[PDB]
Amino acid sequence: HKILHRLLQD
């Protein structure tokens, strides 16, 4: 999915 999600979670 979106990279942004990942960057937000960690």
Add this chain to the structure above:
Amino acid sequence: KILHRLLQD
């Protein structure tokens, strides 16, 4: 420009 005529009127 029509805008002129309306502004100047």
Add this chain to the structure above:
Amino acid sequence: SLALSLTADQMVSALLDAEPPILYSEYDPTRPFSEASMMGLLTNLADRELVHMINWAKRVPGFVDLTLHDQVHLLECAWLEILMIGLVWRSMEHPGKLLFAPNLLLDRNQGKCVEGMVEIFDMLLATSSRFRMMNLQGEEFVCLKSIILLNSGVYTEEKDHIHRVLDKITDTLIHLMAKAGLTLQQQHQRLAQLLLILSHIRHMSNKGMEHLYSVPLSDLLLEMLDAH
């Protein structure tokens, strides 16, 4: 110069007196309905509204102190924002609908009659919802509309005269809120709330134009457009 001597009550009086009328559309409830025809009606309406807006602008304190050049620039920059805030204002008492004209009330249904207008529709609806939530007053509305006129093109001197008029309108907004019984803290908070909505109105205007360049247009509208 006459603008700088107005008390806040006099400023409000002046703006209220300057208000344009609410125009009717050519909408026929029997008549059938096309993407083109819908846009046709709205174009016909906006064009007539523009005439009133131009003559309204001349009555906004400070505006006649500017060159023809600077007046043209401000209106070119702001006209869609101004039509939009007007629309959002008269749509306040109609949840889920936009009152384009007294005889033209639409929800997001036939907003989809036009490609991408549904996006702008939802944004306009949200703004109307926000005004309704805040219980926006008529006196506050006319202040906001005048701010849009003076502010939207100001960053593309008489630019400082414009900032002084803008400061006056700010004073006027605060005075209105103090009269409604708001504490000083509540006044500053509400002032900020109102002005942040102006960022969204700018956003809506820009997105509208972008979709436009992605319809029939009057000669006056055309002059305004290829100003963007």
Add this chain to the structure above:
Amino acid sequence: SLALSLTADQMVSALLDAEPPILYSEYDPTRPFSEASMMGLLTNLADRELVHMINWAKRVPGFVDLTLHDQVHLLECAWLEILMIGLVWRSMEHPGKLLFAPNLLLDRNQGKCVEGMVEIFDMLLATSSRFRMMNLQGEEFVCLKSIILLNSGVYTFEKDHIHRVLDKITDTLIHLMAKAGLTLQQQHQRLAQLLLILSHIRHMSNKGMEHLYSMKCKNVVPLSDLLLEMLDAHR
């Protein structure tokens, strides 16, 4: 939400501490610039700035309280505005120039590089000039940048939560102004002045997104998957 319990001074301190670092441009290529090399440098820089922005945002009081989806939405809406206000801020003491990085300072002559960047260039310069003449303070700037994050996507959606935090930042702006010695009239007047500049920052971002979208289609420079995702959200 812990953010509402903060005092104004605590809010300021938290926002100052949350500030991202100032990144450097690639040191190659250097001046002069082509449209390809210019966009290449700016794209590379912006991509690295975004990573810090995301970690900055999760440190803005109230932001962590939102659902992941709402967090994504706000950052997707505001990211270019936030990069731009940052650029204008660090360009303030360089009148007539834009300090994209300490080793990448540009004037409008270099703006014609990839039209219509010159139009946006001039808008950025004007904003920097306005901030400088207003003697905008760092404490005011971090409040404004946080306002952009929380406000820019709020009507494209508790929204009450975001609005309470926004009120808190308004309280903080006034608090900063009062202790700078401004009178009551000067206080609400400067508050309005600052917030109206935010509508211009929105305008610049909108015009900027268009440009980046055209660049994407022109395929002059390969964009990062992250930048594409941030961009696609505005299509």
